[PDB]
Ligand code: HEM
């Protein structure tokens with residue numbers, strides 16, 4: 001999400017994700033908690049076991065927010081304002097953790113959409129996830 | 142450079158730097174080449190010795206570009222467009238190196254302006270230098 | 283790195299299935315496309331303009347193969363990562379001047395490529411072990427910096 | 428870390444002049460102001476709202492002093508950084524779950540504070556040696572991650 005060509009790639013790739021955005025969000029969270037145990041610290045009130053209902057529900061919320069973002073690529077700060085305050089001012093999430101979640105989401109997309117996850121699309125997605133991360137941490141700036 | 146309060150701190154601090162912007166730019170480059178030897182790689186055509194005329198001249202160019210930036214805090218991408226192309230498309234500077242130069246510039250300011258380099262001002266400057274770095278690497282995004 | 287016996291065995295079993303030529307070529311190619319400043323170190327490979335030119339470049343495929351072969355050595359020598367990569371650390375620091383952050387980037391790209399190739403078999407638990415491996419290699423390559 | 432004999436001597440000489448209470452309090456305070464996510468780990472210190480509240484907080488000064496004292500141990504044990512920081516690495520990983528990137532951040536803040544306190548005496552050559560020290564401590568604290 002930045003250049004015209006990147007916006008086109010991101011919109012097209014997310015069309016292929018479609019109604020699976022919630023499921024992929026949940027899986028990406030699972031890959032993150034297992035691969036990067038430092039992240040479990042933000043979720044003391046969750047059951048973090050595999051198949052947990054709370055992770056499922058939260059993954060849906062993450063997927064919906066990403067789906068929102070793709071619809072508002074020309075005004076991410078406006079569309080994601082409530083979430084900036086939450087992550088940066090209330091939760092004080094360490095910015096490094098956004099890079100970790102992004103990697104886990106890219107990993108999850110590779111698993112499920114191997115033919116659609118081309119080098120060009122991977123590069124556009126990376127930029128998109130970095131743009132979202134910047135917005136969510138923008139209160140730190 | 143972002144929030145109103147940060148813009149005010151940055152403008153005020155740079156007023157104290159004043160005509161020394163070029164000298165501090167040169168010193169920051171020197172601290173970078175010595176502290177972080179990987180950076181010397183981008184400057185094979187320079188004499189990198191202490192007091193070198195080329196480092197002096199280049200430090201002046203860096204200081205002037207920062208002085209420009211402070212005058213255009215509401216449109217950094219517009220003001221710094223020529224420089225984005227140079228650093229990202231022609232030179233392919235690794236983004237990590239901007240964080241290293243920023244640290245060395247902050248170090249140099251601490252040396253010369255110890256009474257003016259307060260915690261509030263340090264925080265605003267950090268944000269300013271990060272905003273400049275983002276613009277100069279924005280072609281990567 | 284410290285893996286359980288179960289973890290090590292699952293890591294090794296997956297490696298049996300890794301085509302170092304296909305995976306290696308794809309991993310290096312994606313690094314060059316997704317993080318374009320890395321192209322600076324590979325100027326001698328010729329045309330690296332667009333994704334098509336990168337992914338089909340014979341020098342990219344040949345070098346990617348060498349990189350994966352070297353990863354493979356690490357995977358079979360998990361107790362002596364530092365010793366296995368000592369010479370390569372020296373080359374990358376002293377001669378090439380590559381910032382260590384880029385070793386982490388290539389490691390993560392390799393994981394994404396493994397995920398693409400193995401799909402559902404590349405489970406969240408298996409990725410977790412590979413993340414360990416990847417970090418261990420990055421740290422071993424950074425040691426002489 | 429690997430310093431020449433001349434470098435080590437200059438590092439040690441500067442440390443003779445370091446007030447661990449003043450420098451330590453200022454370094455931790457600036458970390459909390461400049462990188463506000465770090466405040467998450469220090470909730471028990473009370474009011475950390477604004478720069479004024481942070482810099483004057485007695486718990487920030489007392490903890491900053493402890494951190495600098497521990498840095499001082501590293502400076503006097505440059506050959507055995509890993510051994511000197513083994514216990515603290517365990518605490519920071521296993522109990523506190525601090526991301527290692529933050530050790531680098533605190534190290535750089537300490538250098539900026541040294542620059543502020545020593546001015547022209549903190550030469551480009553002396554900063555270069557301190558950068559080595561700071562990286563060595565960060566790496567030693569990250570070792571058990
Ligand atoms: C792509 C980046 C991210 C997106 C789009 C995102 C999205 C969201 C959304 C939409 C919510 C609101 C749920 C609700 O209103 O109940 C939320 C909450 C939350 N997020 Fe994030 N998030 C991101 C990154 C992160 C990261 C990296 C962390 C930390 C590792 C994190 C930790 C949390 C926590 C602790 C909550 C509150 C959960 C609760 O108490 O129910 N988020 N996130």
Ligand code: HEM
Nearest residue numbers: 180183184202203206207224228232234238239242273277
């Ligand atoms: C605050 C961030 C930076 C600013 C404001 C800045 C500013 C500038 C300016 C104004 C020029 C143009 C000089 C001219 O037109 O002759 C330039 C050129 C250049 N910059 Fe940067 N720069 C920054 C960061 C960096 C970094 C981090 C590196 C690499 C470590 C770098 C490497 C170079 C090189 C190699 C040139 C060409 C020099 C020559 O051949 O004469 N710059 N920079």
Ligand code: HEM
Nearest residue numbers: 320323324348349352353370378380384385388389419423
């Ligand atoms: C997982 C991390 C990496 C591994 C395992 C690895 C492995 C290797 C190997 C096996 C060689 C061949 C050395 C020889 O001929 O003896 C090599 C060379 C080289 N590497 Fe890496 N590497 C890694 C990361 C990187 C990165 C991130 C870069 C990007 C700057 C890089 C740039 C180069 C270059 C430019 C060469 C020389 C190729 C030539 O002959 O022109 N390496 N590396």
Ligand code: HEM
Nearest residue numbers: 465468469493494497498515523525529530533534564568
């Ligand atoms: C240069 C790197 C660092 C050094 C040398 C250092 C040193 C120390 C020392 C000496 C202690 C006291 C341990 C004891 O009582 O036995 C401590 C505790 C602690 N550290 Fe660090 N530290 C470093 C980095 C960090 C960072 C970046 C954070 C930010 C998350 C952090 C968070 C904490 C916390 C929350 C405690 C516990 C304080 C309490 O009792 O509530 N440390 N550290």
